[PDB]
Amino acid sequence: SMSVKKPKRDDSKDLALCSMILTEMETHEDAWPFLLPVNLKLVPGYKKVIKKPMDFSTIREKLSSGQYPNLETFALDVRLVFDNCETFNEDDSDIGRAGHNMRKYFEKKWTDTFK
Questions:
Q1: Which residues form the Bromo domain?
Q2: Which of 73, 82, 83, 101 fits a 20 to 30 Å CA distance from 91?
């Protein structure tokens, strides 16, 4: 509350460290469905169904240009990638599977870097 603060968690390395995680997600072999925005002209259904498209290249631009206020907002957009994937793709499909793999991969790096 006013003039009453929890001790200050050091957040000065958070930018760099999100950048590293994002690089590791960009280079994973199952990243291919998530590297670029889904083409809304060429994928029927996507535009109407997926209210908030996200992908790695959009995250990278946001990151690089100070559009994440903190590490949680960055995690939210990475998890949105995978939520969108689960919304649109059957679990038993290459893309469906890729999204589950990448989410597991991300969640582990997140815990090991920050928790």
A1: 9-113
A2: 73
Do 38 and 99 touch, CB atoms closer than 8 A?
no
Give the separation between CA 45 and CA 8, rounded to whole angstroms: 46
Please give the resolution of this entry in Å, rounded to 1 decimal. 1.8
Output the CATH code of domain 1-115: 1.20.920.10
**How many Cβ atoms from other residues are within 10 Å of residue 63's Cβ?**
16
Q: Which of 51, 50, 58 is nearest to 26 (CA)?
A: 58
CB 28 within 8 A of CB 102: yes
Measure the CA–CA gap between 25 and 35, rounded to whole angstroms: 9
DSSP conformational letter for 16: H
